[PDB]
Design a binder for this molecule. Structure first.
Ligand SMILES: Nc1ncnc2c1ncn2[C@@H]1O[C@H](COP(=O)(O)OP(=O)(O)OP(=O)(O)O)[C@@H](O)[C@H]1O
Ligand SMILES: Nc1ncnc2c1ncn2[C@@H]1O[C@H](COP(=O)(O)OP(=O)(O)O)[C@@H](O)[C@H]1O
Ligand SMILES: [Mg+2]
Ligand SMILES: [Zn+2]
Ligand SMILES: [Zn+2]
Lengths: 658, 495
């Protein structure tokens, strides 16, 4: 039949030592046992989880070694095998559960009502213990610090990868380092199922220890022993115990993959209060038990002796507001002074020059006023900045760098992927094969910045969305029978490449690029950065570039790089602020606009300028004054603010020659 | 005294508390409850809000209630039901309907009138509670609140046709032809063993008559999590909703609704043939109340007449349609005249004569024509605002397309057919393709569109009005050159 083998481990002495450790253990550094305190805390319907530390277990072993009596190296037994010690510890907790000391508080708990109703009828006229349980038991991996303190080495907490997980580590407690890619919704998994039986005896309980089960549907009680055909069992959800279950996939980091290989993936299962600890896009260190999946059902026959695997998770270690602190940070930055120039300069300190562009990127980072006028009129406060110019002028570092500053931002590129206009209504998700409404990148960045690199090569299909956002900021959705309009208020940062190379003495700016005049008119600001050879500038550029290669540090200079978290804190605080205008300030704007138009009537010339001024220019003047006012000022806007905005616009306009 | 098994709810006290609540409650107790200051007590304290709705429902005969949770908590003694309903919705609602059964009698015989009450006896009543508790999204739902009333919010994606549900089986005997009806409980049909007729009494002589049973209606709805609450780098989640009886065919596709209902979870089978089930349930909600996000009265007629008696009706609605637009009064005059349209006639001999006005706006590129079109879009009852930049060549007319959910054929009308009897606004008229332009030609000439594809040959009705806006080539419309060169439009289409 089944042969027998002798193994050193005996579970009786282990159980005795667990019972001794629960009572005796004290924190050496409230007084008394460490865990009977938290058990009493649990009994008062406040704590939902019990977490054991193997450092503490080593402390009990060290205490016993100080006494000198032999031990059973419980820490090694837990590491080698952990699926059984969970049940052992659960039984040990159940045996020594303290009484409720205060605030019994039975209000509307359905399971409580069922259990209380059971008592009267059972006594007047044995169930699975897990039904009465509420706490969840988790283990905590070892610490190298405590290990090195008492040697003994450590295996459970070592940050292995997905690839270093061999088949020799199955059934042990290990830790894996990786990035979370997919997380699923929370669903209930049955643990104890209760069937109601046509007022025959009473409801019956069955435990489920697999992913698949069979209903009972036959009443075996003493009163139900009567021979007449009477009916099968019906399930009752209220008297049954469920649990929260979640499954995730972790993927190997790019640094740890060897050359020529493709990264692998691992599956993680989490049950209990630990659910929702992991989200997509997080680099974490997850500890758990590595167990074999049954792989049954279809396609099991072909494998024969091949199994799946998964990791039952028990611990999570993620690697990486209005308060007086941030109230004082802004005051400190105000007392620092030179906020405008320093804020513009610290943006991408590697790149030397293009300081006006850095001023304009700051105004794009902040947003103008979005005022909802009555009778349906709306006015946009978002910023549309396009940066044109010859190749090899740092076109595509500037952009990427701006994406770092604001959390709400997406870097979308040419026809390699379609994300600008992918407001599709069909999503063939493999998990369920049903449609999901999937928004595009333009919709994704709300109150944010959309960085569209290589805008020249992008197709007219995305041009439709770009045209519509600047008009109404509300994306109409695909024609898959939903008729949905989605909010898409966003600011646009575009990078352009002139047609066939560099700037051309062809006079029309429309000839330099493919973009239509109407599309360019909606842009708030246009910047031309042409590469003109000058003997002085090349020397400083070469020196600046080569200093970075010689020493990895950027070239030290009197200019001080402000700390980036301060950048974010000031930018957010400015964004929260709401300006206001006065009647006197806007009167000078009319004079400015009429002077600009009287210039534009004669400004039509062979080479310089793009068409003529439009009322959209007046709108953008106020829109840009918004950000310059939000930068440091409040309440009414200064008159010199309009001068600053006009100066920035005029420099951008004069960039056509330069 | 006796309590329904499992729960702690007893009918005896609940019925009495509810009748006390209904005959006792007023806005007085409600405004004492909320007491948020600046609370009006101007004769509202004695209005008897529940009794007046009860009487108006009795005289109308409709059965719809809007019982609220805060109002239910307002009364001190009935405060128990507030926490007794969240945990046991079904039994409390069963008591609800049973008490409303005699709520009619409690008021019909106060003056001993001659109401029949027999049609009241036959008809049944129910309730639609709302605002049960704090609204929480589907992203936060644990197994800890199964079979408890919740309030959810989400986007409607799709609906399914009516689903039959058996209520009363019907078995006939193939020998003696005897008919008997067997009720079904929770889906399972208890088969008749042998014919009840003692004389017939034959084993295995039963036949099911499918079309002689009794059925009820079901509908299933699909929801999606709203984009506002979703965090970064996530995919929206979905929930299925069960709708029964009068609430079927209420939620249109693409709307955003807040619903109240009972959370539930059921098992689904592992193997289709075997009895075996798998240890992971599916979660859904059974809904009880749904909320979203003609027949003009005589007073409206009188005010319409007196306003129509204004000295200058032309200029007033000239300025009303586009409040933001300054000057450009003449184009507003034309649009106001267009929105009414001349009379339409179709006499037998000559045929139909058109009664729609078509308007084309064009000129320098940075005027405000698009805002004008979006203004006239809203005023008109039925109309469509779609640009002519691209899309399918028959995107404004019928386009036979394969159905996505089912591998079937669906005939989908376009934007010109969907603007029948109204004003259809076209934007960016100059970018419309040479092949689709001809379609508009048959629309503006015969007002009908014919489709002949996939074995389908048919004609639809356009009968709409075209308001279009265009842009020239260049940054200005120089008056010296005539219209034709600048607008890039065929002479007949402009004509
Ligand atoms: N002002 C500058 N300061 C520092 N580096 C600069 C500057 N202008 C250009 N560079 C150099 O240009 C490169 C960054 O821009 P890069 O040429 O890679 O992309 P791009 O400007 O978008 O051009 P392309 O059309 O080739 O993609 C780096 O090698 C960088 O050292
Ligand atoms: N007569 C006007 N009255 C009010 N606003 C105007 C007027 N002319 C131009 N504008 C402004 O100019 C912009 C015009 O944009 P719009 O006309 O929609 O673009 P398009 O030229 O594509 O139709 C609007 O934002 C509006 O505020
Ligand atoms: Mg580049
Ligand atoms: Zn039984
Ligand atoms: Zn018979």
């Amino acid at each position: 039949a089944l042969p027998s083998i002798q193994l050193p481990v005996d579970y009786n002495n282990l159980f005795n030592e667990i019972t001794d450790f629960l009572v005796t253990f004290k924190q050496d550094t409230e007084k008394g046992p460490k865990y009977m305190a938290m058990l009493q805390k649990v009994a008062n319907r406040e704590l939902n989880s019990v977490i054991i530390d193997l450092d503490d277990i080593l402390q009990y072993q060290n205490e016993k070694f100080l006494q000198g009596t032999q031990a059973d190296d419980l820490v090694s037994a837990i590491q080698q095998n952990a699926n059984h010690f969970t049940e052992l510890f659960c039984r040990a907790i159940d045996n020594n559960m303290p009484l409720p000391t205060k605030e019994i508080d039975y209000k509307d708990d359905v399971l409580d009502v069922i259990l209380n109703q059971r008592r009267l009828r059972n006594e007047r006229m044995l169930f699975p213990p897990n039904l009465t349980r509420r706490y969840f038991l988790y283990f905590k991996p070892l610490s190298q610090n405590c290990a090195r303190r008492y040697r003994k080495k450590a295996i459970s907490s070592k940050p292995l990868s997905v690839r270093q997980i061999k088949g020799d580590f199955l059934g042990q407690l290990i830790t894996v380092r990786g990035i979370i890619t997919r997380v699923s919704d929370v669903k209930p998994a049955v643990e104890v199922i209760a069937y109601t039986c046509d007022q025959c005896g009473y409801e019956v309980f069955q435990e489920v220890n697999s992913r698949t089960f069979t209903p009972l549907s036959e009443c075996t009680s003493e009163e139900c022993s009567q021979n007449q055909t009477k009916g099968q069992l019906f399930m009752s959800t209220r008297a049954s115990k469920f649990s929260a279950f979640q499954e995730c996939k972790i993927q190997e980091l790019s640094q740890q993959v060897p050359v020529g290989h493709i990264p692998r993936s691992l599956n993680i299962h989490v049950n209990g209060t630990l659910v929702r600890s992991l989200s997509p896009g997080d680099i974490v260190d997850v500890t758990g038990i590595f167990l074999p999946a049954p792989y049954t059902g279809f396609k099991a026959l072909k494998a024969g002796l091949l199994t799946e695997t998964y990791l039952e998770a028990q611990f999570v270690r993620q690697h990486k507001s209005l308060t007086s602190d941030v109230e004082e940070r802004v005051m400190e930055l105000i007392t620092s002074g030179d906020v405008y120039n320093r804020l513009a300069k610290s943006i991408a300190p590697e790149i030397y020059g293009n300081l006006d562009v850095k001023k304009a990127l700051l105004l794009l980072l902040v947003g103008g006023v979005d005022k909802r006028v009555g009778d349906g009129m709306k006015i946009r406060g978002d910023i549309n900045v396009c940066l044109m110019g010859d190749p090899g002028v740092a076109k595509s570092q500037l952009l990427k760098a701006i994406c770092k500053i604001s959390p709400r931002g997406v870097y979308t590129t040419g026809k390699g992927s379609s994300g600008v206009g992918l407001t599709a209504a069909v999503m063939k998700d493999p998990v369920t094969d049903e449609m999901i409404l999937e928004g595009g990148a333009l919709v994704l960045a709300d109150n944010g910045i959309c960085c569209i690199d290589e805008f020249d090569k992008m197709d007219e299909s995305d041009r439709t969305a770009i045209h519509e956002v600047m008009e109404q900021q509300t994306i109409s959705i695909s024609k898959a029978g939903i008729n949905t309009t989605l909010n898409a208020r966003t600011s646009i940062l575009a990078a352009a490449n002139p047609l066939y190379g560099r700037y051309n003495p062809r006079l029309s700016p429309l000839d330099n690029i493919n973009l239509p005049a109407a599309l360019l008119s909606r842009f708030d600001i246009l910047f031309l950065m042409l590469d003109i050879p000058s003997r002085d500038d090349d020397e400083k550029l070469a020196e600046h570039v080569t200093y970075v290669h010689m020493h990895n540090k950027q070239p030290d200079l009197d200019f001080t790089p402000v700390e980036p978290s301060k950048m974010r804190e000031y930018i957010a605080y400015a964004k929260t602020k709401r300006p206001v205008m006065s009647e006197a300030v806007n009167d000078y704007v009319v004079q400015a606009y009429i002077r600009l138009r009287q210039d534009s009537k004669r400004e039509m010339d062979s080479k310089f300028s793009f068409g003529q001024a439009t009322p959209r220019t007046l709108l953008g003047i106020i829109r840009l004054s918004q950000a310059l006012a939000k930068l440091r000022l409040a309440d009414m806007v200064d008159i010199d603010d309009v001068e600053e905005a006009l100066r920035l616009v005029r420099v951008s306009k004069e960039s056509l020659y330069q | 005294l006796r309590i329904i098994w499992g729960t702690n709810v007893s009918i005896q006290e609940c019925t009495t508390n509810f009748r006390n609540f209904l005959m006792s409650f007023k806005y007085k107790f409600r405004k004492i409850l909320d007491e948020r200051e600046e609370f009006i007590n101007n004769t509202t304290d004695e209005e008897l809000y529940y009794i007046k709705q009860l009487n108006e429902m009795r005289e109308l005969g409709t059965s719809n209630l809007n019982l609220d949770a805060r109002n239910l908590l307002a009364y001190k003694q009935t405060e128990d039901l507030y926490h007794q309903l969240l945990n046991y919705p079904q039994e409390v609602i069963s008591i609800m309907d049973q008490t409303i059964k005699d709520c009619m009698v409690s008021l019909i015989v106060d003056n001993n009138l001659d109401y029949d009450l027999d049609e009241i006896e036959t008809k049944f009543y129910k309730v639609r509670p709302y605002n049960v508790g704090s609204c929480k999204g589907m992203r936060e739902l644990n197994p800890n609140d199964i079979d408890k009333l919740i309030n959810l919010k989400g986007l409607v994606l799709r609906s399914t046709p009516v689903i039959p549900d058996m209520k009363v089986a019907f078995f006939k005997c193939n020998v003696c032809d005897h008919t008997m009806a067997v009720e079904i409980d929770r889906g399972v049909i208890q088969e008749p063993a042998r014919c009840e007729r003692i004389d017939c009494n034959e084993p295995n002589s039963m036949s099911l008559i499918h079309n002689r049973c009794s059925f009820a209606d079901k509908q299933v709805i699909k929801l999606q999590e709203t984009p506002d609450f979703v965090p970064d780098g996530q995919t929206p989640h979905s929930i299925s909703l069960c709708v029964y009886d009068e609430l079927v065919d209420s939620c249109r596709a693409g709307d955003r609704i807040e619903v109240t209902g009972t959370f539930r979870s059921i098992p689904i089978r592992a193997n289709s043939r075997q009895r075996v089930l798998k240890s992971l349930y599916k979660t859904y909600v059974d809904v009880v109340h749904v909320k979203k996000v003609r027949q003009i009265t005589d007073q409206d007629l009188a005010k319409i007449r007196e306003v129509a008696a204004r000295e200058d009706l032309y200029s007033l609605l000239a300025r009303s349609i586009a409040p933001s637009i300054y000057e450009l009064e003449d184009v507003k005059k034309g649009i106001l005249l267009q929105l009414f349209g001349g009379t339409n006639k179709t006499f037998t001999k000559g045929g139909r004569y058109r009664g729609d006005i078509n308007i084309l706006l064009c000129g320098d590129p940075s005027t405000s024509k698009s805002q004008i079109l979006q203004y006239v879009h809203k005023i008109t009852p039925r109309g469509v605002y779609t640009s002519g930049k691209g899309s399918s060549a028959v995107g404004l007319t019928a386009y036979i397309t394969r159905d996505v959910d089912t591998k079937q054929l669906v005939l989908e009308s376009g934007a010109l057919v969907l603007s029948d009897g109204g004003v259809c606004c076209i934007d960016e008229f100059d970018k419309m393709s040479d092949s689709t332009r001809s379609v508009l030609h048959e629309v503006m000439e015969q007002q009908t569109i014919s489709i002949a594809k996939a074995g389908i040959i048919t004609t639809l009705n356009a009968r709409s009005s075209i308001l279009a806006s265009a842009n020239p080539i260049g940054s200005r419309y120089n008056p010296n050159l005539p219209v034709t060169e600048n607008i890039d439009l065929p002479p007949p289409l402009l004509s």
